[model samples]
Target: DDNINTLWTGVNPTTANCQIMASSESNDCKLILTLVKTGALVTAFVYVIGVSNDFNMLTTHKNINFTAELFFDSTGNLLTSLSSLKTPLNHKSGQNMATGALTNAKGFMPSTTAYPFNVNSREKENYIYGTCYYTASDHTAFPIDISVMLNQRALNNETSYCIRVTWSWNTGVAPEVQTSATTLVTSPFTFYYIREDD
Candidate 1:
């Protein structure tokens, strides 16, 4: 894998206006999806920086259910001519935001609590996309600033920038899996240099 795919260290590409919902209010954040190979599949490591003035914007220990479609501008075109490809819901139609609100989805925990939050979760294998729902057992600030490692098989080998997302979230509020608005992340991608050969 290292022989074929690698993250370009020359530039620091990033996305802006990453929409994040905290309870009833809307929050702004930036993201950088890094391409790193684990064993078999190329993974997108999510790095979010919350721009919410309210430190408590994100509830602690809350499980956030999410299902998304990640489109790539493979030819380095504008993030306008989007595609319907990504780790889709049910692996059938990777189209539409909030198409899949999978329960027991991926869980996220904040790596740091300070401003410009740092969130992270355990590295998972590609091809399995699940949204997280809060548990009644544990309550802490860990899941506030969550980090996600997503599947990036669609973006193979070609070096590019920005990933447009058609995404939705369930803030563990309604008993049924429901969503308010479909969020589209049309921001450019960003990440630090990580050598594969090393």
Candidate 2:
């Protein structure tokens, strides 16, 4: 009765179409996540999702830990050394950041310890860099809606750069009966740039 068998995650403006801006906070690339589930019991678990070089990194119902965000060139290669395209985007609290939390607990807020800006690492592996949902309840929590903000400041302007953000989650319980598939877990966002007036 407490098994969260099936789940579905949806995104609006599925493709990130992010634009680099000349002024600070000029680029407010917002992403909305619609997390739905099928269950009739009360349960809580931490939801995890993040950026990956490739898609479908987690096909199974297991937890993978990440500390940073992954950045890949338009040609599908990791940005290893120091470059203007390292971690070009920064995260900010969305308008409805706390809409997904059912209780007064610490839920639906992006971890302050995760990737911010001007900080990146060369994990060199898929699904190695990402963010987590932290905590949430599932008492008939059919749809867990939340928003994500990505800001682009001073960065190289290129029409050939993009990033893939994927979502893979696991219930606190081990061996979930029927977990969501990884096929519908990734979204693409194309990055562009523009010059500002002086």
Candidate 3:
């Protein structure tokens, strides 16, 4: 759906080892899948029986075909699937600076969303802060550089979307406002996945 909301999909966004293997004896191919996180990466093993014939060799991310499928839309969200693992790492996510009327439309989620950033009642506008989040089974002792993507669907009602740019904690602070540029943006639409200090 074209609903402006935050969604989540499980992917190793940094870079895939493009790892795979083939056993010459059984013509079976086993892919060593790594879920690349920011600091450290986790891995899973996928055993396939000859998913590819012409791709009869094995190496670091050989030009063979393999896939891993599992998606969601934040606490429980997502859109379409990725176009094979080799495709650029991205998800049709990032909190859009708007809201929709279909809150109770899909699964069991909050009746609110639309603009995914936050402004503490305690903080003043000048002290406004921007934030991004991720689901982690672990955290790194150091920070890792990751890319954020912003897809601008269109401009919102000009009069209502007054928070664009200028460091204010409103809808305009969304990637939607400063888009038409880098395939960049950050944070999911909803705030539930947000955790300690971020």
Candidate 4:
């Protein structure tokens, strides 16, 4: 019987983290994940592990200075320890600019305070506020593809997990709209040595 369930949903436009709503059963688990920035600016990435009824935001730390080319290990170790990722980093398109002039653009104009840059002079008709230039048929602002690996060390143990992210613009504002990403692993992906014998 299959033991892993994967699902996808739209990220909240105003929040910091997107929830991974899925159910799984496994002992040791590793989530191999990736994110795409669908917004107009370079957003910050944050994640938490071991989320359950005991979920505590205080224990989680923000993953800093990430870029498109950088890949983080299961332990939250960054592949690139540099100060920051390349600009227009990890964009769906190689570039950041949206299509058409200001009036002809399809994307929403981020509020002046919603983006990292000064909207007064930088505002374009058809482009996203803080992203680079270039248009793709399917522009997914944030695409996260993660492979969850269950550790066979523990078996038959039911656990719940959650994950979330915060965008750069929504970091700290009144009535802040930070996205919350969460997932629930109902079953163990792998079993312990003792369970193998059973």
Candidate 5:
């Protein structure tokens, strides 16, 4: 199982201590410190150099509104509000290509036809809201997949950053599903950019 070490490095969820669970790891390992843990949802945070990547976070709160905040530093200060809204990323009920073969193909896509992350300001040194969802169909199963991207077009070079995703249920009501955290590095997807100034 020598190759298994190349997969992941196990770290204490509570304590930010990491063991050499994997080799061939790059300086990127330091970014793993931003991971957050909710009930059953696992989420992580990662930093990309000069590209955009999706940040995936999970949640288990049905009939509740979730809020996320991205920070420039770890002190919880200088915070920017991250918002969530229901998207049309779900498959039509019973429209399965094959029964049960694609049970969880309900999510967002990056197209003009699809929902895109609405950033409050397109400036550097600021936080932009990613994406979030609600438990629309299933009450018992409150599993949510959140996707956010950090675009650093201003900086042609890679820079380090921190992001935090938070969840909240209905007022005075307990969450029905579990939540967790994980982080991913951004590898910008190619798209045509038409410069207006040019």
Candidate 6:
């Protein structure tokens, strides 16, 4: 994974205004999703920030899960249900492990060869386009951020999409499977690709 902080400078990425809800008490955790449209390719960065609170966002005791789904509505109204939208296209996607300016020792690394988010759950599909990420280390590197690569061509023009993410404190457990994880959701994100006319 490449360092995206420098590349993000002056990019003016767009973020949705929503709340990060936890399964139980307020953990004061932050889930920020930055969508940057670069020509035909869009890079969505998911930032997992931990604050000085009782809950640990990056503790070894928890497992994080991320999911992305495609949706569209004739009107701008957010679709109440997934059934309203047709099947999503099999788009090519990949997750880039963020390498911040901080030393690699303190950076985020894969929990295990099989668990990128540090768990062994099948609720969320981690790899897209048959590609994934893992750091070369034994210690559990806390994840500061990760990026998802997407192609605008895979989605319908003028359509909307959203991302769903969850963090759990138990091994191999997800929010959908139980109710002890931090769940976050973004609002309907309307996409407008760059045209040659522009």
Tens-place lDDT per residue, model 2, 103-142, is: 2111112212231323335222211233333221222222
- Cα lDDT tens digits, model 4, 1-198, are 110111111221122121222221221111222232233431222222323321212112232111112222223222232201211112122222222222211121122232212234543321221221111123323222222211211112221111112122121222111233233111112111100000
For lDDT, candidate 1 versus 4, the one ahead is 1
Ranking of all candidate structures by their lDDT, best first: 6, 1, 2, 5, 3, 4
Clashes of each: 14, 1, 15, 47, 17, 0
Evaluation by TM-score, superior candidate among 2 and 4:
2
Q: Which stretches of candidate 4 lie over 4 Å from their true place?
A: 1-47, 50-79, 83-198
Cα TM-score per model: 0.31, 0.21, 0.17, 0.15, 0.22, 0.31
List of clashing residue pairs for candidate 6: none
- Minimum summed lDDT over a 10-residue window in model 5 is located at 82-91
Q: Write the per-residue lDDT of candidate 6 for residues 65-160, one digit (tens) a residue.
A: 433332333322223234111221111123322333322210111112222232336423333222222221333222322333222222444333
What does candidate 4 score on TM? 0.15
RMSD of each: 16.1, 17.2, 18.4, 21.7, 17.5, 15.1
Model 1 worst lDDT run, 10 consecutive residues: 107-116
lDDT of 5 by residue, 66-181 (tens): 22223221221222222111111111222211112212211111121122123444433222233323332243333333334332321111212222332223434332223332
Global lDDT of each candidate: 0.29, 0.25, 0.23, 0.21, 0.24, 0.29
Estimate the TM-score for candidate 6.
0.31
- lDDT for model 6, on a 0 to 1 scale? 0.29
Assess the local accuracy of residue 150 in candidate 3 as a C-alpha lDDT between 0 and 100: 16
Candidate 2 — which pairs collide? 47-133
**Residue 179 miss distance in model 4 (angstroms):** 25
Q: Across residues 75-107, which tens digit of lDDT does each residue of candidate 3 receive?
A: 322222221222222222332222223232123
